[PDB]
Chain A
Amino acid sequence: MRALLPYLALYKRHKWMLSLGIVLAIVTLLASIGLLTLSGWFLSASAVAGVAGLYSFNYMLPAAGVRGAAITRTAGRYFERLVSHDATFRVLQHLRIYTFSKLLPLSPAGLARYRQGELLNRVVADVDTLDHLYLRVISPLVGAFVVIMVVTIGLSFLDFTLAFTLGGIMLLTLFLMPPLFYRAGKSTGQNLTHLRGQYRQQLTAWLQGQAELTIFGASDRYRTQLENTEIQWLEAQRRQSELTALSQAIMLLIGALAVILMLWMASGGVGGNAQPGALIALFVFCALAAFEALAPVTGAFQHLGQVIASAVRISDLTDQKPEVTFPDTQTRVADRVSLTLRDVQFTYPEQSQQALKGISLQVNAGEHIAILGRTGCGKSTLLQQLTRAWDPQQGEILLNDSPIASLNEAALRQTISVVPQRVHLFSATLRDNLLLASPGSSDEALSEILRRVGLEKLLEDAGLNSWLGEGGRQLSGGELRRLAIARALLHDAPLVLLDQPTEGLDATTESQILELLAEMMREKTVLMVTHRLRGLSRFQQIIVMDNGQIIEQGTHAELLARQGRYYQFKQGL
């Protein structure tokens, strides 16, 4: 319950729609109880009065109560559904924004804790569970406690001992039963997660390795232990369901203990009176309808285990320390960037080298560079430091003779336009996968770029309105690398980083992109990282390096005469 505090504080926004939907839940539940308690009295009062006491009865006031307590039961239910669903969609919207606003400052680092395919799916399914804390937990519990108190307070004007014996019974089962069935079904809840996550392990292995199992003949014996885990899983689901069927009987017994006690103990004196008469039916019919408010409180407490379980999962990721901080200053982005590196590492130490020092390459204001390194030696991790994924620990990056850490976030993003190795489609209109780079751009300025890059195919049918990503029309590798370059062109930045262009692309497309890189970014300094010796003549100042250290350096023409490692890379192996 302590884990929920950061997410209860999100309710301060929309604290009227949330509380109105709990107020209407109580008002509905009291018109439900009041109408049956007033009806139970009216039959008992009139029958005891009989025909003789017709004129002394004054039935007019109950007829106003019946009309009053029946309008509020209907309107109260209709508006407790609308308000508590409207309030549920606001908090979902506020959890989605808050989760995104916290995960953003630590997007590249920190979030790489496991396979992001599963991590990002159990954050979406955890925000949806923190969205159930209002209607599925808070509302049935808070609503039932106020209804128990309002009944007990209002039912104590007649007989104090009779109110606290009904309220006391209801208050015990509100506070003793939900924490006691949760405790009884906590062990099986553990045995139900250890098996559900073990069936997904065996199923995913059996599905993915279906080629390696049919060939080797084990597809039928690795499905038998899969079917064997489901059987244990289903048995553990039967025990958990054999417990919910107990809290549904005990609720029907406690609600029967209260009825029996009100029939019995109100048979004697109700308050001062020794024969209550109509007051007997008022108490009994209140114990009949009161336990309607206690129906969801049990199940609303085991779903508190799920919500708390997910309130630590989100608090684990969101409340992480970002590794990068940005000064809050306003600066102008220059049109000529001369990147200068000094003593900054190019690769995490591999094979326990413990000697890799930082490179010290210098990039002129408008000259293209091409860092050419061996594949499989280590991660490139050079674009991370330039885009400030994490502040470097070896040396300093100087961008246009001013520290890169001294550059504002909104200005750093405008001085560096990077195309990554992994291009992403945002499952939106093709127009909005390019409005990404330039927030304000005429819709024609896009379409000229598409043909200008070589994407006229995407304009053939429903150009700029087509669906991409998961909604369909996944782009091919060559089709996709051209899209990333298209984004960078719109997001005009003096310095352009290319993580690894023409990787996994064929020679016809490889020569297509490399030329497109040449004239298009003539004025815009680039720093291209690659391990392919294609079309590097148009480049200058080629940085060829292996095992974390610079071996030689110079223009492609210079390297061939130098007869160094680059020449070896050119002829044979």
Chain B
Amino acid sequence: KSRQKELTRWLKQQSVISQRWLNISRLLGFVSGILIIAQAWFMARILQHMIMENIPREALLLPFTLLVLTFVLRAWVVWLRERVGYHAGQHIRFAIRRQVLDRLQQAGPAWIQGKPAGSWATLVLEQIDDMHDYYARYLPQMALAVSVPLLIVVAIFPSNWAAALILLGTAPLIPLFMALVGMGAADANRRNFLALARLSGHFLDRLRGMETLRIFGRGEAEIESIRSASEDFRQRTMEVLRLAFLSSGILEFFTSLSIALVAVYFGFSYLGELDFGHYDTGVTLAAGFLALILAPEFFQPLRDLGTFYHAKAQAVGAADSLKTFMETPLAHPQRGEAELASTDPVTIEAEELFITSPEGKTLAGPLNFTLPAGQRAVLVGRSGSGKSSLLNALSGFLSYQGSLRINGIELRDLSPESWRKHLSWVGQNPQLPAATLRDNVLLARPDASEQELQAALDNAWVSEFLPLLPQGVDTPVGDQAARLSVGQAQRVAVARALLNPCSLLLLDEPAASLDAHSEQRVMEALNAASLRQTTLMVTHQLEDLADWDVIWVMQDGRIIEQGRYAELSVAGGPFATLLAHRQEEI
């Protein structure tokens, strides 16, 4: 059909989460349609008494008291309707944010890594909150545009069938005109809303790359680029907005004709020119003020719906991305139920192993390695080899189509919640996720004796830089480990890995781009830590792999070499070439 209607269909399907709140909001929009009529009937009966019969105001207190009562009731319903309206939108946002975090939690960390985490917080914060005004204001109002206009003519029809036909006559003509040619451009508006967002990613791109613009002297020639890009957008948009605003104008025309025709018909009816509309009875003045007061209230729900246009347009854009997020097919690692009997070092073996990304793309080709229990193997190779894909597969973050048997038990059959307890990982980036450094280290087990926590801090060389921090061990870590440096951020990650007994330890480039002194400190901890259990380290620091008993070299996703450091150094194979390349860097 149309991308415009297949999102509105999606946006209507999410509203079921809170169909109760959207029914009180529809009901109160029907009470408010009655209180308007009671408001107008009293005002017409008040006005007729003091205009025709010349009754003094002091005699008119029963209608005035009931008129004030009706005005208070409308303000109560309006106050009620916009608090029921909020709940209609919150209980949907709260349940779609749960449908997004789950889908992101259910998907592995490798999936998350595809997009920057500042773009995942756009989907979760700024693009789910954009859908509030659609369910809190646009959906309750689109039901107020049928509740009141129908209820207005039904109230006027007893009084006068002509003034009830001037209003109702324009009831079908508007939705036709807003759909005869306006709908052709409403989707064309959704394409402009995408261009305006893409134009603000073109301004951002210029801002991000000002350093490159400066050095090449394109500072003043990329201002004309901003001008041309902002002029094409404006020119393209107003070829569309020249038609999209007819709906605003036309609706403002049928509400001007209807108030004009009501005034002219009643005006001439009083003068005797027109003698048909009434029910064969004199047209009372209050029969003309009833229709005239309600004539602008007939079109008021539709004119307030134009005010909420951007409520829909910023939710259709938000539903554009959310829908394609819950609809993209993701391959998840297979979850089994078996669990390891013992906490002894595991034995890893593979037979024609293929590691695949969430989108089915193969990351690591056929692997036939085999790692006996307690043996510290090393994964080396050029960037893009897929060495990390192997350390992520053993963690259960990636799905494989081969055989990867831990202690003979296939990794698919292993229930992760029990397998991850026999695992520890350091990784290239520390990524501490807690607030206090003391709880960053204790993330392995929440409660440990101070003997254990101190043992981790000293063994990982965290104790030597606590005084440098202001509050010491209990120092806050802040946004992305800002308070402390990367050199000693990695050292906190090591202390987190050494805190619990482990059966398999994975170390994916620990010294990578690390401070020179803190690089030696971590190596000293891990080289001593890797001896106690089956270890698998990824590194490019090839000059000190002498002690590690097995070395695998990965090229193009497949292991192409094996053996200890002593014989690979002189073998002249791929490792020697890699060793030669590393020896140059100082």
B205 touches which one: A218, A275, A427, A437 (CB < 8 A)?
A427
Residues of A within 8 A of B443 (CB): 212-213, 216, 218
Q: Is the CB of A470 within 8 A of B205?
A: yes
Whether A375 pairs with B204 at a CB distance below 8 angstroms is no
The residue of chain B having its C-beta at the shortest distance from the C-beta of A508 within the complex is B382
Which of B218, B234, B271 gathers most chain A CB within 10 Å? Answer: B271
Given A104-B219, A238-B90, A280-B50: A43 and B211 interface contact (C-beta under 8 Å): no
A303 CB within 8 Å of chain B: no
With A43-B289, A212-B427, A260-B64 already in contact, the answer to whether A248 and B264 are too (CB < 8 A) is no
Is A96 a contact partner of B203 (Cβ separation < 8 A)? yes
Choose among B51, B90, B263 the residue that contacts A278 (Cβ–Cβ < 8 A).
B51
What is the CB-to-nearest-CB distance from B283 to chain A, in angstroms, rounded to a whole number? 8
Query: Could you say which of A47, A54, A246 has the most chain B C-beta atoms within 10 Å of its C-beta?
Result: A47
Max chain A CB contacts within 10 Å: which of B266, B417, B584? B584
- Whether the Cβ atoms of B584 and A533 lie closer than 8 Å is yes
Decide: A47 and B270 in contact? CB cutoff 8 A: yes
Question: Is the contact region of chain A dominated by helix, strand, or loop, or is it mixed?
Answer: helix
Contact A259-B256, Cβ < 8 Å, known A128-B200, A245-B83, A491-B216: no
The answer to whether B586 and A267 touch across the interface, beta carbons within 8 angstroms, is: no
Docked CA distance A275–B56 (Å):
9
| B570 interface residue (CB < 8 Å to A) | no
Is A498 in contact with chain B by the CB < 8 A criterion?
no
Within 8 A of A (CB), among B173-230: 200-219, 221-223, 226-227, 230
A264 touches B271 (CB 8 A): no
Contact A248–B79 (Cβ < 8 Å):
yes
Given A44-B51, A108-B214, A120-B204: A57 and B271 interface contact (C-beta under 8 Å): yes
Which of A158-166, A195-203, A354-362, A519-527 is the interface stretch?
A195-203
Cα–Cα, bound, A208→B428 (Å)? 13
Judged by a CB distance under 8 angstroms, whether A35 is at the interface is yes
Task: Determine the chain A residues whose CB is within 8 A of the CB of B417 once the complex forms.
Answer: 217
Enumerate chain A residues within 8 angstroms of B233, measured Cβ to Cβ.
Answer: 89
Interface string of B434-453 (1 = CB under 8 A from A): 10000000011000000000
B-chain residues with CB within 8 Å of residue A288 when the two chains form the complex: 293
A121-B204, A504-B383 known; A214-B64 Cβ under 8 A: no
**Nearest CB on B from A89, distance (A):** 4
Contacting A at CB under 8 A, from B505-532, are 515-516
Q: Which of A54, A253, A267, A436 contacts B271 (CB 8 A)?
A: A54
Binds B, one of A76-84, A170-178, A392-400, A458-466: A76-84
When C-beta atoms are compared, the residue in chain B nearest to A238 turns out to be B86
B117 close to A35 (CB less than 8 A): no
Say how far B28's CB is from chain A's closest CB, in angstroms. Answer: 12
**Does A86 touch B at the CB level, under 8 Å?**
yes
Question: For chain A residues 548-573, which have a beta carbon within 8 Å of chain B?
Answer: 569, 573
Task: Given A85-B241, A204-B118, decide whether A506 and B214 contact each other with a Cβ distance below 8 A.
Answer: no
Contact of B23 with A by CB under 8 A: no
Q: Which of A480-508 contact B (CB under 8 A)?
A: 487, 491, 504, 506-507
Please provide the chain B residues from 232 to 246 with a CB less than 8 Å away from any CB of chain A in the complex.
Answer: 233-234, 237-238, 241-242, 245-246
> Which listed segment binds A: B69-77, B334-342, B346-354?
B69-77
With contacts A74-B249, A207-B121 known, is A248 near B82, CB below 8 A?
yes
**Inter-subunit contact A264/B64 (CB<8 Å):** yes
**Chain B residues numbered 84-114 whose CB sits less than 8 Å from any CB in chain A:** 86, 90, 93-94, 97-98, 101, 104-105, 109, 112
Could you say which residues of chain B place their CB within 8 Å of the CB of A476?
384
Cβ-closest chain B residue relative to A94: B230
Bitwise interface map of B from 413 to 427 toward A, beta carbon under 8 Å scored 1, else 0: 000110011011101
Q: Which residues of B contact A241 (CB under 8 A)?
A: 82-83, 86, 136
Query: Which residues of chain B are near A49, meaning CB under 8 Å?
Result: 270-271
Q: Is the CB of A215 within 8 A of B125?
A: no
Q: Which of A190-241 contact B (CB under 8 A)?
A: 196, 199-201, 203-219, 222-223, 226-227, 230, 234, 237-238, 241
In the complex, residue of chain A having the shortest beta-carbon distance to the beta carbon of B82: A245
What's the interface size class on A, roughly? Answer: 35 or more
The residues in B between 377 and 425 inclusive whose CB is less than 8 angstroms from any CB of A are: 382-384, 392, 395-397, 416-417, 420-421, 423-425
Tell me whether B215 and A413 are in contact (CB under 8 A). yes
> Does A214 lie within 8 Å of B264, measured CB to CB?
no
CB atoms of A203 and B203 under 8 A apart:
no
- Selected interface stretch from A143-151, A306-314, A337-345, A418-426: A418-426
- Is B433 in the interface zone, CB < 8 Å from A? yes
In the assembled complex, how far is the CB of residue A499 from the closest CB belonging to chain B, in whole angstroms?
10
Q: Is B253 engaged at the interface, CB distance under 8 Å to the other chain?
A: yes
How many Å lie between the Cα of A284 and that of B67 in the bound state? 14
How far apart sit A426 and B97, CA to CA, in the bound complex (Å)? 33
A211 touches B226 (CB 8 A): no
CB 8 Å contact bits of A444-464 with B (1 = contact, 0 = none): 000000000000000000000
* Contact (Cβ within 8 A) B433 A203: no
**A104 to chain B: which residues have CB within 8 Å?**
210, 213-214, 219
A47 to B285 Cα, complex, angstroms: 7
Contact B207 A532 (CB under 8 A): no
Q: Are B64 and A506 in contact, CB atoms less than 8 angstroms apart? A: no
A418 to chain B, nearest CB (A): 5
- A96 and B226 form a contact (CB under 8 A): yes
Interchain CB contact under 8 A, A75 and B249: yes
A491 CA to B431 CA in the complex, in Å? 41
A479 CB to nearest B CB, Å: 12
Min CB gap A249→B, angstroms:
4
B-contact 0/1 string along A55-98, CB 8 Å cutoff = 00101001100110010011101100110011001101100110
> Within 8 Å of chain B (Cβ to Cβ): is A48?
yes
B259 within 8 A of A: yes
With most chain B CB atoms within 10 A of its CB, the pick from A74, A244, A470, A506 is: A74
Q: Are B209 and A217 in contact (CB-based, < 8 A)? A: no
**In the complex, what's the smallest C-beta–C-beta distance from B313 to chain A, in angstroms?**
13
- Pick from B56, B272, B433: contact of A209, CB under 8 Å: B433
Is A117's CB within 8 Å of the partner chain B? yes
Interface pair A507/B217, CB less than 8 Å apart: no
A179 CB-CB contact with B under 8 Å? no
A-B contact pairs, 15 of them (CB 8 A): A74-B250, A124-B200, A205-B434, A237-B86, A248-B79, A249-B78, A259-B71, A260-B64, A263-B43, A281-B47, A285-B292, A418-B215, A506-B581, A510-B581, A534-B584
Interface residues of A (CB under 8 A from B): 28, 35-36, 38-40, 42-44, 46-51, 54, 57, 59, 62-63, 66-67, 70, 73-75, 77-78, 81-82, 85-86, 89-90, 92-93, 96-97, 100-101, 103-104, 107-108, 111, 115-118, 120-121, 123-124, 127-128, 196, 199-201, 203-219, 222-223, 226-227, 230, 234, 237-238, 241-242, 244-246, 248-250, 252-253, 256, 259-260, 263-264, 267-268, 275, 277-278, 280-281, 284-285, 288-289, 372, 374-377, 387, 409-410, 413-414, 416, 418, 420, 422-424, 426-427, 436-437, 439, 469-470, 476-477, 487, 491, 504, 506-507, 510, 531-534, 569, 573
Which residues in B have some Cβ–Cβ distance to A below 8 Å?
43, 46-47, 50-52, 54, 56-57, 60, 64, 67-68, 71-72, 74-76, 78-79, 82-83, 86, 90, 93-94, 97-98, 101, 104-105, 109, 112, 116-118, 120-121, 124-125, 136, 200-219, 221-223, 226-227, 230-231, 233-234, 237-238, 241-242, 245-246, 248-250, 252-253, 256-257, 259-260, 262-264, 266-268, 270-273, 285, 288-289, 292-293, 296, 382-384, 392, 395-397, 416-417, 420-421, 423-425, 427, 431-434, 443-444, 479-480, 493, 496, 515-516, 543, 577-578, 580-581, 584-586
The 9 closest A-B pairs by CB, nearest first: A209-B433, A413-B217, A78-B249, A256-B71, A93-B230, A39-B263, A267-B57, A211-B109, A249-B79
Please give 16 more A-B residue pairs, beta carbons under 8 A apart, in addition to A43-B263, A50-B270, A470-B205. Answer: A46-B271, A47-B285, A48-B52, A59-B267, A85-B241, A104-B214, A116-B208, A210-B112, A216-B420, A234-B94, A241-B86, A260-B67, A285-B293, A288-B293, A420-B211, A506-B581
